[PDB]
Amino acid sequence: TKAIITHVENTSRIYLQFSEKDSLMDIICEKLNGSKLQPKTEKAAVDDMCVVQFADDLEFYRSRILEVLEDDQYKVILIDYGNTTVVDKLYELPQEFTLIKPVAEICSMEPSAIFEKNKALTLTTFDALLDSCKGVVAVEFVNKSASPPVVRLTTKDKRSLKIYEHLQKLVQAELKLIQK
Q: Which fold has domain 19-103?
């Protein structure tokens, strides 16, 4: 099955939107960016659901409060995607979205000490790898009962690049160039 990677926390915590939900994601975006949203009139608390404007693209997203910060700021998660950001204004979540689960689901790649011993290098290499397929991946489940479920990811393009094995190879190659 096909999905798009929308956020990487680490190799064991990856947010993906599975293709079955592409139209649903489009409708959420269209509805949030198509009508006037209502600013909140009092402070929110951790875990409150709301909507924020994302500074990077100026568009609107379903959000959940992660932290109540000083200076009336909030760290929030964009629940449909997984990335976090800091905003100074919150909007009410329109009622029609209340029961709709977050679009993105969390999965994990297989474990590797290479990834754990070299976190920053692994993540920057992974980012470049994902950019090379614009985040579009084929997904096979290794362990569905795990939390997050463990998966194998392949670039959804002509290379069919095997990400778990390839990422290990690239990281080891850079470490070897520097250290040997």
A: SH3 type barrels. (2.30.30)
